[PDB]
Amino acid sequence: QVDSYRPKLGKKFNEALVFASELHAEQRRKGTEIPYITHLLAVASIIGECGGSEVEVIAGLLHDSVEDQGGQETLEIIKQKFGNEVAEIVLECSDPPWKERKTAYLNHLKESKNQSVILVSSADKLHNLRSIKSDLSEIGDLVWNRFSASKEETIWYYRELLKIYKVKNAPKRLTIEMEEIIGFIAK
Amino acid sequence: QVDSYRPKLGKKFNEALVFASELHAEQRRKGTEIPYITHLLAVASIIGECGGSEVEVIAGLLHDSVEDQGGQETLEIIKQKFGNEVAEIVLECSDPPWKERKTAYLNHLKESKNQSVILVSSADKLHNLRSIKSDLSEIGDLVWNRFSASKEETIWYYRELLKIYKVKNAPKRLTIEMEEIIGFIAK
Numbered sequence: 001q002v003d004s005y006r007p008k009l010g011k012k013f014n015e016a017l018v019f020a021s022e023l024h025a026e027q028r029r030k031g032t033e034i035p036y037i038t039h040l041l042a043v044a045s046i047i048g049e050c051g052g053s054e055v056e057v058i059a060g061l062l063h064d065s066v067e068d069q070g071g072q073e074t075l076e077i078i079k080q081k082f083g084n085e086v087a088e089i090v091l092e093c094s095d096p097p098w099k100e101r102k103t104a105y106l107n108h109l110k111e112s113k114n115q116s117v118i119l120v121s122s123a124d125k126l127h128n129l130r131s132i133k134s135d136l137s138e139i140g141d142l143v144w145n146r147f148s149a150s151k152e153e154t155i156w157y158y159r160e161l162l163k164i165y166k167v168k169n170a171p172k173r174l175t176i177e178m179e180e181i182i183g184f185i186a187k
Numbered sequence: 188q189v190d191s192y193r194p195k196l197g198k199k200f201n202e203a204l205v206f207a208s209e210l211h212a213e214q215r216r217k218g219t220e221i222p223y224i225t226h227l228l229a230v231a232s233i234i235g236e237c238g239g240s241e242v243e244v245i246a247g248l249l250h251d252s253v254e255d256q257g258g259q260e261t262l263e264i265i266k267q268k269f270g271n272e273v274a275e276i277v278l279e280c281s282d283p284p285w286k287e288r289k290t291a292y293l294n295h296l297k298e299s300k301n302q303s304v305i306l307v308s309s310a311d312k313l314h315n316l317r318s319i320k321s322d323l324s325e326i327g328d329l330v331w332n333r334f335s336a337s338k339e340e341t342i343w344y345y346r347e348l349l350k351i352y353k354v355k356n357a358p359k360r361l362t363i364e365m366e367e368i369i370g371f372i373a374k
């Protein structure tokens with residue numbers, strides 16, 4: 001259990017792994033029995049594979065913690081454990097008629113001054129898209145029964161997200177695959 | 188930091204997250220600066236998404252620990268921390284002319300009596316295939332300069348692995364995607 005010297009993903013990342021898993025222990029991927037931690041681990045992995053910093057990988061593990069697991073009190077815990085830079089990425093990632101809310105979030109991302117937010121966001125969306133594709137191969141169009149929007153609305157939203165990620169210089173390794181999946185799931 | 192009641196992925200899984208990250212802290216994905224923990228998190232995620240048990244997800248986090256991070260002494264630590272069932276999956280996953288070694292490992296998987304080994308193995312290979320595909324989109328054929336075998340040998344080996352996973356009833360969500368990626372990377 002030696003602690004290596006100045007590893008890129010070290011003690012704070014390991015603390016974040018445990019914190020994310022404990023915080024989301026009872027949460028499930030919508031419509032399934034799959035533990036939600038699977039999504040957070042996948043997003044953290046993608047961010048790391050894009051050369052993400054420790055702060056960015058931690059923000060990836062925690063990007064759903066304020067929305068889904070306690071709001072402002074959880075944000076304060078994130079600050080205490082992981083610092084304000086992580087907390088600021090998480091808050092900026094966090095999110096009236098549905099279509100206006102979507103447009104507001106898209107413009108929020110478009111105007112962001114934090115490249116870390118674009119990296120975390122695009123990794124989150126890539127994992128969600130891979131998950132739709134995999135579910136389609138198992139249950140077919142039953143996958144769409146898990147969403148709070150139509151297939152057409154969902155495809156529109158992902159297409160708009162992709163355009164923003166391109167204009168904000170998200171990693172091409174992510175946007176290339178996104179574009180392939182979107183075309184696939186659009187039939 | 189409440190501990191929920193009997194979560195599927197609980198205290199031992201959280202201990203395994205930390206152990207895997209500490210053990211592999213200095214290891215990098217071959218040919219890159221990417222921390223190796225990214226691979227282990229991705230494999231654990233895939234196993235969980237296929238309905239894997241806690242034992243299976245932990246084995247996924249640890250499937251490269253004996254080969255890459257200390258052999259039999261590390262196996263004994265795995266037994267002490269996570270039990271002999273996890274250790275037995277890890278050992279059975281772990282691996283003379285190259286082509287005969289490959290054939291021996293393929294037959295080893297084919298004869299396995301442990302469905303957990305097939306699940307962990309197929310998740311490992313799916314992540315490796317996704318990684319090749321993503322790297323191809325960034326660096327093109329330079330990806331092949333990272334391997335200890337030719338492109339033709341690598342494609343052959345993945346094709347044979349896929350056939351075994353199908354005959355051993357690995358999850359179709361994994362083998363369907365494997366087959367797509369293999370065809371893509373084969374040009």
Ligand SMILES: [Mn+2]
Pocket residue numbers: 039063064124
């Ligand atoms: Mn998310």
Ligand SMILES: [Mn+2]
Pocket residue numbers: 226250251311
């Ligand atoms: Mn592996």
